[PDB]
Design an enzyme around this catalytic site. Structure first.
Site, PDB file in Angstrom:
ATOM      1  N   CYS A 109       0.809  -1.218   0.000  1.00 38.27           N
ATOM      2  CA  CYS A 109       0.000   0.000   0.000  1.00 38.27           C
ATOM      3  C   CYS A 109       0.845   1.272   0.000  1.00 38.27           C
ATOM      4  CB  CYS A 109      -0.938   0.010   1.207  1.00 38.27           C
ATOM      5  SG  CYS A 109      -0.095   0.137   2.802  1.00 38.27           S
ATOM      6  N   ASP A 136       2.343  -6.478  18.326  1.00 31.97           N
ATOM      7  CA  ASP A 136       1.555  -6.334  17.099  1.00 31.97           C
ATOM      8  C   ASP A 136       1.144  -7.684  16.521  1.00 31.97           C
ATOM      9  OD1 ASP A 136       0.219  -5.300  14.950  1.00 31.97           O
ATOM     10  OD2 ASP A 136       1.937  -4.243  14.080  1.00 31.97           O
TER      11      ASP A 136
END
Length: 300
Positions: A17, A132
């Protein structure tokens, strides 16, 4: 014509992205590499410190312990661009999830759990907490380099050292911290704004293992109002869900695991052997074999 980081690696098509992930080619070895870029004018960046965490795992070009992506170079592109060149990997567990119709077998989850408990143990041994946990950050190796049966761990920009530089002890317990990772899997304590320890990685792992076996988690499409309200309704739902119900399928091994990692203390050291001993026992009590045969080991 021609994006270049270090007279060696030539950048290729954009493959990711707001940070941009791009394909590369080692003009010396004809290797295919992964290049992670960052705009020099970035308010609160994290590419450099992600590279720093990679060095502590070391993970230095040639070495790289198993399950850790090699790090090739840290340079700059153009042209207002900081870049980290690392190893190219295959699909993620979320990619493979959707490939397997969003439902992993027990055998696969157990194989996954075995690797990750090892993987996450090494991270902690290097004095780091991951913070994470999500299926998107665990990638199988490329089929070309016979490592298609290895689960890797990536994305270390949100990690913290839990061993202080001064005093040389465990970081003190503070609260009212922000709210970091992915709400789908994050621990109960994290929702309360408590500082994350080694216990909180394991709880998220457990949350994820459940996601694999079930299909989704009961705090799924809890969508409403603001982001601060979105995190609340998810966190307030996690504390109102019995583990005997969350694992209703479903071997008690996943129930006792979740109780263990939740009832742990902030400073307390986890028994990784014991956690792996629970799944390995269940594994062989079902009579499974470890040849590297996952549910996906034929599909795309």
């Amino acid at each position: 014509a021609v994006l270049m980081v270090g007279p060696n690696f030539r950048v290729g098509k954009k493959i990711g992205c707001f940070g941009e992930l791009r394909l590369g080619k080692n003009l010396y070895n004809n290797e295919h590499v992964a290049i992670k870029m960052e705009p020099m004018k970035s308010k609160a960046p994290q590419l450099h410190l992600e590279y720093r965490f990679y060095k502590l795992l070391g993970s230095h070009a040639d070495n790289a312990p198993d399950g850790i992506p090699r790090i090739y170079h840290l340079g700059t592109c153009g042209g207002r661009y900081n870049a980290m060149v690392l190893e190219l990997l295959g699909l993620s567990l979320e990619d493979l999830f959707n490939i397997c119709a969003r439902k992993f077998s027990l055998k696969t989850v157990l194989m996954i759990a075995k690797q990750l408990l090892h993987r996450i143990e090494y991270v902690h041994s290097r004095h780091l907490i991951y913070r994470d946990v999500k299926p998107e950050n665990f990638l199988i190796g490329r089929t070309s380099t016979k490592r298609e049966k290895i689960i890797h761990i990536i994305d270390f920009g949100l990690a913290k050292e839990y061993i202080d530089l001064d005093t040389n002890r465990h970081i003190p317990y503070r609260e009212h911290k922000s709210l970091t990772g992915t709400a789908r899997y994050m621990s109960i304590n994290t929702h309360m704004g408590r500082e994350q320890s080694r216990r909180d990685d394991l709880e998220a792992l457990g949350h994820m293992f459940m996601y694999f076996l079930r299909g989704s988690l009961p705090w799924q499409g809890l969508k409403a109002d603001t982001l601060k309200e979105r995190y609340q309704k998810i966190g307030d739902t996690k504390r109102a869900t019995p583990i005997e119900v969350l694992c209703d399928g479903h071997p008690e091994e996943f129930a006792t695991y979740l109780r263990y990692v939740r009832r742990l203390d902030f400073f307390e050291t986890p028994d990784y052997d014991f956690l792996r001993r629970l799944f390995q026992d269940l594994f062989d009590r079902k009579g499974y074999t470890d040849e590297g045969e996952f549910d996906w080991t034929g599909k795309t």
